[PDB]
Amino acid sequence: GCCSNPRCAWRC
């Protein structure tokens, strides 16, 4: 996904 990467905390 993207929250699966710590650069995407804000939204997934």
CA 11 to CA 1: how far, in whole Å?
Answer: 11
User: Please, are residues 11 and 4 in contact by the beta-carbon 8 Å criterion?
Assistant: no
Place of tokens 């990467």: 5
Whole-angstrom distance between the N-terminal and C-terminal Cα of the chain? 7
User: Please, are residues 3 and 9 in contact by the beta-carbon 8 Å criterion?
Assistant: yes
Taking each continuous run of H as one helix and of E as one strand, the counts in the chain are: 0, 0
Return the ∠ at Cα 10 (arms to 7 and 12), rounded to 5°.
85
Q: Which two tokens stand for residue 5?
A: 């990467």
CA 1 to CA 9: how far, in whole Å?
Answer: 12
Beta strands in 1-12 (DSSP E): none
Method: NMR
**3-class DSSP assignment, residue 4:** coil
Q: Which two tokens stand for residue 2?
A: 């993207």
Q: Which two tokens stand for residue 11?
A: 């939204």
